[PDB]
């Protein structure tokens, strides 16, 4: 084979290896997965600083060669759990991720499975989206970041599902605890309901006609964001509240989120990375 190879983890659609090109010496990441071959390959020339670069596509069964990043945000959050990630770095990372989402959404590409392990960081302060759910689009599953319209059975969900996931990640960076740590689809939905209130037609028109909506759902009252992400200042809570709107049509877009006052003082700090 063309590479020398070491496992780094499991994406949603296949296993990921750190590897060195035998002839070139390039250090890269290889994802092994298992027409569509087409639109994936366009993504080689659609590049953004906050999206992981796809280097090559190879089919026998399907290999994807990516640039290599040195840490993922789950490991970085775990490493930072005793002290917390500094607010300026949280804010820089959120801003960068919204830039990546604005870009891919503007090209009508959804991610669909944002989670801390899929967000990759380097020593220079960048963070990049990875592990796009693009294989269906063209070992226990984590539901903690799933938008409620997905859980309620919406077939044709939108770019808003990514804003929801990013909102959950934002909250988790701030509080150092997962916002909605469910272990089943209904447990995930009811954890969301218990925190944000059971949605109704007032806050989410059409929710009661969603495929998996049940009139027998318990009706929980909404608690206040002061309780949900206490340390976060009012600008951060306002932005988070707009990222976690039940109605996908009221939920803030990535482009709109970038203009939120929370980012008026955004900067690009350097993380303390132990590699
Ligand atoms: C795009 C392919 C890729 C490139 N770098 N990289 C990294 N680098 C960080 C890193 C390096 C060395 C050891 N560790 O533990 C982390 C991790 C990672 N992933 C996290 C773990 C689950 C699989 C996979 C998901 C997201 O692609 N995927 C990638
Ligand atoms: O990230 C993955 O694992 C992944 C998986 C599959 N797949 O499984 O078919 C396909 C593509 C993937 N990444 C592409 C990253 C990418 C480069 N330029 C872009 C421009 C817009 C949106 C995204 C990108």
Numbering used by the authors: 3 to 36, 47 to 72, 75 to 152, 162 to 298
The authors write:
CDK2 is a member of the CDK family of kinases that control the cell cycle and is activated by binding E-type cyclins at the G1-S transition, then by A-type cyclins in S phase.
To substantiate this notion, we determined cocrystal structures of CDK2 liganded with 1 and dinaciclib or 1 and roscovitine, demonstrating the ability of CDK2 to form ternary complexes with type III (compound 1) and type I inhibitors. In contrast, the potency of ATP-site inhibitor dinaciclib is largely independent of cyclin concentration.
